[PDB]
Nucleic acid binder design. Sequence first.
DNA 1: GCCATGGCTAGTA
DNA 2: CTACTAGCCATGG
Length: 108
Amino acid sequence: MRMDEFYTKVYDAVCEIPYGKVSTYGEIARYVGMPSYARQVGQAMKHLHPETHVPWHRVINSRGTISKRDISAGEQRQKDRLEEEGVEIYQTSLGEYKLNLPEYMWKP
DNA sequence: GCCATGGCTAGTA
DNA sequence: CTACTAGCCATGG
């Protein structure tokens, strides 16, 4: 399998998500049959124009937190998205937006 | 050829 | 609970 097909598969998947629930970079590389490519899933999302109707925000690291993404402050748009999604979000000791991971994982 | 990034994971201290 | 490991891997200079 080449890239770009890859990219799409992902995108389609991240639309397969149910409003409210979420998944995980790894939990998606694993799925589109490309287990190891978790890190590329981040990038895939990193790309994306702001004009999209794709559910970027509702996706996280296996830690069940908003990944750092060092270069950004959309970490907030991601937050202010799901407290909008009804998903309850709790800020954390020395920073961090975390939340009950397994209330919201996704299943066929 | 190289390394330096990256929205990563899964260990084990 | 945190911190710091291995490994993983495009992508671009």
